[PDB]
Structure 1
């Protein structure tokens, strides 16, 4: 996550298509779950801390 690239958030991307999501926490580009706004790593870390309500370990 390069700091200049956090220019990602833009009210004026100049095009809707140039708009891409990032991780709100670590700034990761790839693997960003839309539901949590996080990336997958952060997702697992916070899920493990219990800071994501309702999120539990799944087994079946």
Structure 2
């Protein structure tokens, strides 16, 4: 994401619907879970890094 776009996202919108996700670690507007605020790619990479309290591999 362009730094201008990142700053505009950091700037609070002037209207309620003018707000979106803007994943925290990188800034990928698609596929940002509300539980973490991260994009799915970053969430997977960090979870596999052993740096999230509760996440683990799923198997059943």
Q: Provide the TM-score with structure 2 as the length reference.
A: 0.91
Give the CA deviation at 1:3. Answer: 1.1
Alignment length, in residue pairs? 59
Aligned to 1:10: 11
Q: Which has the higher strand share?
A: 2
Runs of 4 or more above 6 Å deviation: none
Flag structure 1 segments of 5+ consecutive residues without an equivalent: none
Partner secondary structure for residue 56 of structure 1: strand
Aligned to 2:47: 47
Give the CA deviation at 1:2. Answer: 1.4
